[PDB]
Amino acid sequence: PELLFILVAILGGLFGAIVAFLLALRRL
Amino acid sequence: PELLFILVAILGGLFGAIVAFLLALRRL
Amino acid sequence: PELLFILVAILGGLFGAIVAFLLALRRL
Ligand SMILES: CCCCCCCC/C=C/CCCCCCCC(=O)OC[C@@H](O)CO
């Protein structure tokens, strides 16, 4: 179950980076 | 503990995208 | 060990953000 929780953390970081990009476009 | 794990994973990706953007502005 | 679970979540989240930043960098 260790590797699966890593992908969850990796997928969450992938999601957070796109949120940072969408918030930037919201300003632009 | 599960909610905090996915939270800081999203915050890590949210924080990593901003630092990379500031690293990108350093080029140009 | 609730301390190191959060650290790997930060590492996994930062990993995901760098993935997306280089993933979107390919599209250009
Ligand atoms: C704890 C931090 C709180 C917010 C601090 C805000 C001030 C510092 C920086 C502000 C601007 C951040 C913008 C960040 C925008 C998201 C990153 C992005 O778009 O990357 C992809 C692009 O480079 C295109 O390939």
Please provide the DSSP assignment of B1-28 as one string: -HHHHHHHHHHHHHHHHHHHHHHHHHH-
Quote the tokens at residue C28: 């250009």
Kindly provide the resolution of this structure in angstroms, with one decimal.
2.5
Distance CA C10, CA C28 (A): 28
Q: What angle do CA C18, A14, C28 make, to 5 degrees?
A: 60
Question: In this structure, how many other beta carbons lie within 10 angstroms of the beta carbon of residue B5?
Answer: 21
- Chain Cα centroid distance, residue A3: 17
Task: Provide the chain A residues 1-28 that lie in CB contact (below 8 A) with chain C.
Answer: 6, 8-18, 20-21
Please indicate whether residue A20, judged by its CB atom, sits closer than 6 Å to ligand 1: yes
Distances in Å between the Cα of C1 and the Cα atoms of C4, C5, C14 are 6, 7, 21
Answer for the pair A9, C8: CB distance below 8 angstroms, yes or no: yes
Distance CA B13, CA B20 (A): 10
Burial class of B11 by CB neighbour count within 10 A (0 to 12, 13 to 18, 19+):
middle
- C-alpha of B7 from chain center: 12
